[PDB]
């Protein structure tokens, strides 16, 4: 039913950093994840990690306020798949893997 | 300073270009890009002599890239190899402030077009846009990067002469 999914992140400061991580949970394909600013205009890539299996991805604010929209591409994958997990890991500034 | 105004519409991203002739070296070249209908995302270039950007920026549009970077990645290195001197689609200063010194003696052209970018969060579906602009454009006047134009001395710039196809048919019934 759901084939993609976004999320609505809170407003980056100025000189802010962001990072993004996909996990297959439930041994499902590999999706894309993109960040993309509150309009259709993208601002990264989501790339496939040396382990073979995390999709890591990076980002820092340059604009004066970054409202940001993380993407989870789901249409390369299991077809009619009744469950796909993912653990999306998300954060501002610790890259660690209140 | 010398401050000149322009308007146009982009057809589905193909640009226009102005001819400024004889500038001179040390010239700073100010350029303002702002939508002003449709949902136009605007990007301003600056090159010496003219070659058509439709060609190169059509195959980027080719590209169903590997995923979002990949596409900054292939517009930066195409924008910085076609312009001497580039700046984007919409944001905060509106849409295009781009400041550009004059290398050389020469005749310039600025070009006026769309970017490509994503619109959507449905899908990834990056494209040209489409819509209205005004232009400002200043030879040594600051103010323009400052979001405020006025028409100010001589003029420098006009409308700078190439072919595009498109062809269809359909039947017409006219009856009782």
């Known amino acids: 039913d759901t084939r993609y999914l976004t999320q609505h992140t809170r407003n980056l400061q100025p000189g802010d950093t962001f990072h993004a991580l996909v996990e297959p949970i439930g041994e499902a394909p590999l999706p894309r994840l993109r960040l993309t600013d509150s309009g259709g205009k993208p601002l990264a890539f989501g790339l496939i990690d040396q382990p073979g299996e995390s999709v890591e991805l990076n980002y820092t604010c340059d604009q004066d306020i970054c409202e940001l929209v993380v993407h989870v591409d789901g249409t390369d994958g299991q077809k009619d798949s009744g469950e796909a997990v993912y653990r999306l890991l998300v954060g501002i500034n610790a890259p660690n893997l209140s | ?176």
């Open chain 2, 1 to 176: 300073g010398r401050v000149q105004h322009f308007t146009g519409y982009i057809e589905d991203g193909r640009g226009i270009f102005y001819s400024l002739p004889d500038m001179k070296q040390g010239d700073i070249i100010y350029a303002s890009m702002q939508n002003t209908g449709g949902n136009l995302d605007p990007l301003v270039g600056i090159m010496a002599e003219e070659i058509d950007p439709a060609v190169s920026l059509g195959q980027v549009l080719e590209k169903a890239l590997a995923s979002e970077n990949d596409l900054i990645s292939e517009l930066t290195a195409v924008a910085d190899r076609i312009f001497l001197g580039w700046d984007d689609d919409g944001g905060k200063g509106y849409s295009a402030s781009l400041e550009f010194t004059i290398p050389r003696d020469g005749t310039y052209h600025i070009f006026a077009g769309s970017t490509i970018t994503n619109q959507r969060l449905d899908k990834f579906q990056p494209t040209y846009t489409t819509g209205s602009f005004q232009l400002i454009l200043g030879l040594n006047a600051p103010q323009v990067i400052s979001g405020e134009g006025e028409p100010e001395g001589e003029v420098f710039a006009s409308l700078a002469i190439k072919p595009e196809a498109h062809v269809q048919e359909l039947e017409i019934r006219l009856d009782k």
